[PDB]
Structures are given as structure tokens and as C-alpha cells.
């Protein structure tokens, strides 16, 4: 409809929830050979969802109409923020932890013992714990991620302006949905955006740990995740 039909965004989110099955092999036994390293499990998951991420973006109105170069740029640019925001919102349910797209869980202590507490703990309070509180819905989630996706500032972009405009449309479509679906919540739109800054730091710290784990060998990182970690 209005270029950024809030109606299409929630569908893009619902096409790659995953939705069903993805959590039957992790929370129902499995793992060929073995996998107990929180970091590795998280890394196999990230590689998995990196594909669904491509599906997603494609369903976000106007994304695919952008030059091939631009899509690659935008996805390279915010894949970690996009990925984080998603698994963090999927975790609203779990207790002290997150639910990986593979079905496996990871709790506070496990991350610490893995030496990745702190960044894991702030994810829990700055993202999950916060999304739970205001009960943000898959539509809002998808809108933030879309906002995250359309960043005019990525370098190499063919048309920063287009990317600029699309982003401003998600702003329009979201503010609308909020003023409507939640009239008794005047500042909801603004409260939603407040996440962005925190999501950024977390993003940055996750890349740091990731690059460290890559150089040290060990804790294998499947392709794609490897292709996103080659210094931007």
C-alpha cells in the first residue's frame, strides 16, 4: 500500500520465524557427532539463519528492486544487528537465556563459562528483557529490523537517497501502526526506537568476539558466517 505496507513486513517476519520444525531437532535430541560449545552452537545457528535472513530481506517491500550491489551491501552491513534482534525477540519466552534457531538453549552461566558473558548478559537485559516488558510484536520487530536494514550510510551504495527514503517510509508505517494498535501508549514509537543505540553496541561487541574466535581457530564457523567476517 503506502510503499511500506506494514502488512507485508509482518509477513516477511512470519515466513522465516522459522515457525515449526526448527526447534524439534535441537530440543528433541540430535547433533551429529557432538556440540556443547555455546559459542559454536551460536555460530552454527547464525550461519543457519544467515540464509533465512536473505529470504527475509527479499520479502521486505522494495528491497529486491534495489541494485544487486546495494542488497549485498546492506546485508553485509547489518547482518549481525538483524540476526541479534531476531533471536533476542524469539527468546522473550525463555528464562535466563536465548533460544537459537536450531532449537538449542543457552543460559547465563553457559555464556560466562564460555567467556562470553557480559555481552550475552546485556543482550538479555537490553534486548530480550526489554522486548518482553513492552511486549513488542512481530510487526514492530520486523519494522525495527527493516529500519536497521535500510542504512544510507553503508559505503559503496549506488543510491543512498533511495535507501534513505525507504527507511523514512518504515518510520512512517511504524509510527502509524503504533498510534493505532496502541492508542493508549503515546510514546510507544519512541520507546521502540530507543533500542537501536543499545542494539548497535551489542552488535559491535559481537563482531569483536567473533573475529577473535576466528583467528584463534577452534570453535568452527561454517561458511557464510565466514564470508561475512572478512573485514568490511
Amino acid at each position: 500500500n503506502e510503499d511500506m505496507p506494514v502488512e507485508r513486513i509482518l509477513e516477511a517476519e512470519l515466513a522465516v520465524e522459522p515457525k515449526t520444525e526448527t526447534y524439534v531437532e535441537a530440543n528433541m535430541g540430535l547433533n551429529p557427532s557432538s556440540p556443547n560449545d555455546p559459542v559454536t552452537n551460536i555460530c552454527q545457528a547464525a550461519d543457519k539463519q544467515l540464509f533465512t535472513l536473505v529470504e527475509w530481506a527479499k520479502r521486505i517491500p522494495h528491497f529486491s528492486e534495489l541494485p544487486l550491489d546495494d542488497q549485498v551491501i546492506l546485508l553485509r552491513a547489518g547482518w549481525n544487528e538483524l540476526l541479534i534482534a531476531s533471536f533476542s525477540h524469539r527468546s522473550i519466552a525463555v528464562k535466563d537465556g536465548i533460544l537459537l534457531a536450531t532449537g538449542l538453549h543457552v543460559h547465563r552461566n553457559s555464556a560466562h563459562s564460555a567467556g562470553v558473558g557480559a555481552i550475552f548478559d546485556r543482550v538479555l537485559t537490553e534486548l530480550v528483557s526489554k522486548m518482553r516488558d513492552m511486549q513488542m510484536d512481530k510487526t514492530e520487530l520486523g519494522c525495527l529490523r527493516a529500519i536497521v536494514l535500510f542504512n544510507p550510510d553503508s559505503k559503496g551504495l549506488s543510491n543512498p537517497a533511495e535507501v534513505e527514503a525507504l527507511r523514512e517510509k518504515v518510520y512512517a508505517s511504524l509510527e502509524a501502526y503504533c498510534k493505532h494498535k496502541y492508542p493508549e501508549q503515546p510514546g510507544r514509537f519512541a520507546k521502540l526506537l530507543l533500542r537501536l543505540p543499545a542494539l548497535r553496541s551489542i552488535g559491535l561487541k559481537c563482531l569483536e568476539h567473533l573475529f577473535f574466535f576466528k583467528l584463534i581457530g577452534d570453535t568452527p564457523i561454517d561458511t557464510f558466517l565466514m564470508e561475512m567476517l572478512e573485514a568490511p
Partner: peptide, 16 residues
């Protein structure tokens, strides 16, 4: 760029 292609590749066929 002769690197960062699997991404590109996947961005060229989600129709199927």
C-alpha cells in the same frame, strides 16, 4: 570483488 559471493548468489533466485 571476487569475494562475498554466496550472499550475492543467494540473492539471485529466491523465486524457485
Amino acid at each position: 570483488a571476487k569475494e562475498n559471493a554466496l550472499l550475492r548468489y543467494l540473492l539471485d533466485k529466491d523465486d524457485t
